[PDB]
Amino acid sequence: KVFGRCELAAAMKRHGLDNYRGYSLGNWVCAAKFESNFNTQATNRNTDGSTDYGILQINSRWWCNDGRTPGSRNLCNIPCSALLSSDITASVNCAKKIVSDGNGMNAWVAWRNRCKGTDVQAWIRGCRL
Numbered sequence: 724k725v726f727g728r729c730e731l732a733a734a735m736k737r738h739g740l741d742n743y744r745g746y747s748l749g750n751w752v753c754a755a756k757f758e759s760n761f762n763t764q765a766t767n768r769n770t771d772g773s774t775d776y777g778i779l780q781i782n783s784r785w786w787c788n789d790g791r792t793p794g795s796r797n798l799c800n801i802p803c804s805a806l807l808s809s810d811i812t813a814s815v816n817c818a819k820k821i822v823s824d825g826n827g828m829n830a831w832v833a834w835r836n837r838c839k840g841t842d843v844q845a846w847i848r849g850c851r852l
């Protein structure tokens with residue numbers, strides 16, 4: 724599924740991400756935009772052979788099992804393919820674990836490089852939340 728901007732903002736809002744660990748909703752929408760372009764089916768292979776999955780490009784190196792990333796972990800205890808649903812619940816639940824961990828949203832490369840330090844409020848402008 725390719726989410727609309729406000730559609731995704733609303734979904735993230737009702738799943739409790741607004742100001743979760745201090746990260747306002749626009750940060751989460753911005754992260755999803757630059758990770759997956761709002762596409763729940765997005766997958767990308769990393770140089771080390773792990774793969775990023777879904778709307779928030781969750782990495783099999785640490786967070787989910789795909790059975791093809793030797794030595795990796797599965798900290799969200801979930802098959803990576805489960806992070807590709809049209810329903811964002813699994814990705815949000817895993818994201819909340821990731822963001823509470825250590826370096827916060829810096830765990831998402833696209834967030835650090837494209838959202839952090841910018842005015843992210845524009846990402847939720849006009850949305851019915």
Ligand SMILES: [Cl-]
Pocket residue numbers: 792793794795
């Ligand atoms: Cl292994």
